[PDB]
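Hi there. Long-time user, first ticket. I'm pasting a complex I've been working with (about 1439 residues overall). I'd like to know whether the download I got is complete or cut off, because the file seemed smaller than I expected. Thanks.
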Amino acid sequence: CNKQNGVKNILITFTDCDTQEVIGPISHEQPDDTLPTYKNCAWTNTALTNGYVQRSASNATMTLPVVRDLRVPLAFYQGCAQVDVQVEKFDGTVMTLTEGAVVEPEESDGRSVTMNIVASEIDELLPP
Amino acid sequence: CNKQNGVKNILITFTDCDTQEVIGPISHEQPDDTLPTYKNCAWTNTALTNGYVQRSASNATMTLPVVRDLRVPLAFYQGCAQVDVQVEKFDGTVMTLTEGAVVEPEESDGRSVTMNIVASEIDELLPP
Amino acid sequence: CNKQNGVKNILITFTDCDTQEVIGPISHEQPDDTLPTYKNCAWTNTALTNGYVQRSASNATMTLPVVRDLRVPLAFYQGCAQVDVQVEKFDGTVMTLTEGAVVEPEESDGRSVTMNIVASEIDELLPP
Amino acid sequence: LTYGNRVTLPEFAKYIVAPAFHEIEGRAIPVTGVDDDASGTQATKLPFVLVGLRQGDTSGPATIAGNSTINLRDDFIVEFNMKKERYRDRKGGETPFFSYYDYESIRDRLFNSMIEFSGEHGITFEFVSLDISTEGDVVYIEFRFRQNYEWCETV
Amino acid sequence: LTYGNRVTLPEFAKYIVAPAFHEIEGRAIPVTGVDDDASGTQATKLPFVLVGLRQGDTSGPATIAGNSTINLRDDFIVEFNMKKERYRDRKGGETPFFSYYDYESIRDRLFNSMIEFSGEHGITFEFVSLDISTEGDVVYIEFRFRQNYEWCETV
Amino acid sequence: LTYGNRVTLPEFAKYIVAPAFHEIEGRAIPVTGVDDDASGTQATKLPFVLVGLRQGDTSGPATIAGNSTINLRDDFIVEFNMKKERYRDRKGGETPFFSYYDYESIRDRLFNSMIEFSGEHGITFEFVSLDISTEGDVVYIEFRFRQNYEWCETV
Amino acid sequence: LTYGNRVTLPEFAKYIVAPAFHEIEGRAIPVTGVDDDASGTQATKLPFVLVGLRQGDTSGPATIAGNSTINLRDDFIVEFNMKKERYRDRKGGETPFFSYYDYESIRDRLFNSMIEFSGEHGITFEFVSLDISTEGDVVYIEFRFRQNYEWCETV
Amino acid sequence: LTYGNRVTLPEFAKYIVAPAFHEIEGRAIPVTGVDDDASGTQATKLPFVLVGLRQGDTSGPATIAGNSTINLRDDFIVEFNMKKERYRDRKGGETPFFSYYDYESIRDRLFNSMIEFSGEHGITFEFVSLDISTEGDVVYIEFRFRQNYEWCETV
Amino acid sequence: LTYGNRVTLPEFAKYIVAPAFHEIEGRAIPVTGVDDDASGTQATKLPFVLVGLRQGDTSGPATIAGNSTINLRDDFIVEFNMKKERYRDRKGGETPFFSYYDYESIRDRLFNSMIEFSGEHGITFEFVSLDISTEGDVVYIEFRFRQNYEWCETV
Amino acid sequence: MRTADRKHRVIVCSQQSDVDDEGRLLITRAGVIQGWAAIAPVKAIRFSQDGVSMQKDTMQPTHDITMNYNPDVNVSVSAWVYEHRLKSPPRWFKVLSVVNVDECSRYMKIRCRLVETSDDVTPPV
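Hi, the file is complete. Here it is re-exported in full:
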């Protein structure tokens, strides 16, 4: 059956690591049809020879494009505060990311940012 | 309501870095549809392992396309003059930048330049 | 108002650095709609951290495509003799480059060369 | 409702169009083609809304192999028939039949009903175009929607 | 069946449509073109299904060189002629001839039969477009499938 | 005015065309379609300006999902009906009806009014095409503008 | 044969079509255009095959400079005229004129003759499309081939 | 001249076409549309030249926002009406009305006048196409030029 | 000949077609458009060749600025009017008027002449398309050439 | 046309228009001529429950009206014909063109279109 793919709700919580001030959780709106992206396994693998592999430690990452909300300053999206994000698909799946951090900010024009979020671990909910 | 995106006003002030003579602030006109881009927080991050991050010092940047004003020499756009810029979008935001420096000049043709301003910090106003 | 952009006159003066012989100033014709290109500031900049910049010495460069005149040997365009070039736009601007030198010759087929000219400084005339 | 990831016309017309405008007494008629008959589909009193499929098509991969995520796209249209009403201005004044008709309220509240339904069940449609055209004392307001889905076969 | 990696239209009709819907008493007719003669193919008692080649075509490379993997593509269309049946509601009311007709059941059953045939023999078709149009009291539902194969030569 | 990031055609006519050219005595009419009725919209005394929606359209993404930045685009056309006036030289000569007509003044003043309105309210339109055509002694000058906006929903 | 890297239409018709089907008594007629006359090209008894050039075109570089590898592409078509024959089934049964005609055998053995010829001389053709259409008691089976070559001038 | 970066049709016709060919006595007539009337614009004696706007369009960025470098493109055409003159020989010989007419001199000297004007003021046009066509004793030589500029608003 | 890097159609006809095929007694006619008058250009005694400009066009950049390498492209077509001649046996048989006509000899000789002219003067043409069509007992063979050059101005 | 054929009472009206201040426009239709004229149909009529005829082309005339010529009046592009009957609702005709019958300048033939015929139309002032 597999209800039509697509994002339904995106919640974001900003916390400034200077004043310890909190904002959110605020909803946001997708700017286009591209979807926020996920990778959960916190261990990369690397190809050795003859079937083996070097399992090392790594991160959980997330790529999320959203339209800036015109009340939160833009800097909070370019890697100036800790974020707490939560996505909810249409087929029921909701993926949470706590106390993450924006890595490698890319230029934006003021209305749609693409945050490269890195965090320790993301949890998945698997619609029943 | 999200008034239609776009830039409304662009002010630029050149101050020669030798004779300290000042020109401006002068208005300017976008050459095309595209918009200036921004990055405010002066602290880039880097993906460490296992959710951590190395927070280093960096620059607020700005990339801006403008039509050359036929009374200012082209050199002042190519990076032989400190610049102070201000942009204003329709939705009410304003972005100001002080003691900027045209970095990495790009070969341009004499009527349309794309300046890569780098400055210590860019300030916002956030629509009322 | 800003009269329609485009090139109007291109003068080129060849001087062979072996026989000290001179040819020109000869006019030339643009081969296409792309325009000869300019960059005047003889100082590049590089992005340090936190608003600073390393201002070092560099060149003034110019990129100029022209159709070979069927009397001057092609080698004079591939970086084999000192060139004295002069361009004149439609809005009145004229930019002169003296005793420049063709750097990094690229292959050509015999009718339209693209000279990457490097010189110490270019002067601009700024229509009144 | 049948078709957990989709909404067949009748369901569209009775659950999205009906609870909208109350001036059509539930006269949201599902038709085969919007122009299948102009002499029969012009008898229902004014106003009323038709709903009919224009053409069914694909959205990329469409092979029929038991496991290939058969993607489908149904392009249907919603045609409003609204009675134009002239404004009379005692002194011998009137407004001609070619005066502007405010479709904006119509689009707004139809979109609102669609949004509420999407929030209730997780089913979204694509807007493609809006055309209006009049004839005598009737204004035709023609929306063209397009709906993506995947055809889940049955075991 | 002939052509181990393919089907001809008679085989299609007698193997995928005939074992499907039974209210057609095995009236699955293969024709030259589904619009070549409308005066003759409108005589058979309803409901009946026609199958005819729209156009024979390629799917990339087609040079005839004894070894170049001659690729081929057949575009054919399957049209259902079904009888619309109005409903009567003791009180003297009726449903017009232009009312909505549930084709979704038809597409469902046709696709299930096609999937079963593929899973049995490993031959799959591509769905392209679906068009529905009425006339009098008969509804025409035209599926346009497309089938790719490689042309086997004989020494 | 309604719709803080947009304008409706009545507002367009009464705010950008009416405060502009004064020789039309405030005759800026919004219609359904500029060619829906040519027998009625050729009666108003010259000169008069019509404004009507050509087609409602999208500008990229338009899925209706409660949060997807529903983008919209309406194409409308503004037509001037102006009266051509021949010149007479006493010596017994005249200018034909097919002589050149200075529209450039009209485009100039229309665009200045539009720029002023934008600078006042921050709402801008896109110019697409300009067509001029004469008939009898009336010249038709049809500007085709296009306006992008995002559709605000109401909870 | 003339034109070592090519085959002219007479050659095609007499060496590829003729040694194929023996039911056409070598009546493979080379014509200028396939529709140059429908009143004259329908007198030859059934069955028979026409061969005629549709349009000659290029395949990239085509300048005429004595040494530039002048490339050319000749697009011709092959139209079968085959007499349809109904199947009679004593009991008052018959098969209508719109019953399916097996073009597959035709395509197969035509391709086989083409393959044998290509193997014999090293000349290959491109298949482009296949259309069939009937009229009364005749079925038109229309292939459209396309042949690439280089025009070798003569000293 | 008005419009420092442009030339309006009257200025074109009187400064580029007029000082060219002296056989048209300055009869370079600026019209609204080149086909606005064929019964009127065929009375002026032969030869004569018309100049009229075909359609005004954009060249990329066209939004109207006070500072966006509003780019514009005006597509106009220049139609020569030249009287064909047959060559008589004293022996019963003549040249038909379908003999070749030398447009080359016309194009050459028109281009020369345009080049001199461009050098005098810095305004350049684009050539798009050249069509010729005759009728009775008249040859229509039709150039289609296209002119780019930027619309400088006024404070 | 004029225009050192080019040819005009009269020169084309009298230098490339006339020294070629001799059975036309030097009847190479340049016309305005090869279809401007079919009642007059069907009178000359077959076999005659027409040459006429189809459309004048560009080949990239064409802005008129005194130095921009104005590139030009004139697209013209050469049509052979040849008489088809049936063959008679001695047993009362004949060949129909719709039989194949060997144009390949014609294209061969025309291209050889063009190659020789290019090698003599260094001016080359581009071949685009070839179309053959019969009517009565005359076959029309229409070659469509295209020629690029750069427009030399005069001080 | 024999003078007993003119069996209809019409009011030829010229319309003036002025913009309603709230944002609309208003067409005032005032009478200029009233006389006897004879009408004849040249096309069927699709009515709609309210009178308004559903003609699509809006330029094909449906009724032809003949009346007495008058050399000083100039039937414009903006003329209407309000015909009132005794036991039938009034009708609004919109003129589309005029014919000076045989150029004898004795009768005008006005090709007109039926706009509406219902008991709630605005009579001319």
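A couple of notes from our side: The longest strand of chain I covers residues 71-83. Chains I and E do not touch (no CB pair under 8 Å).
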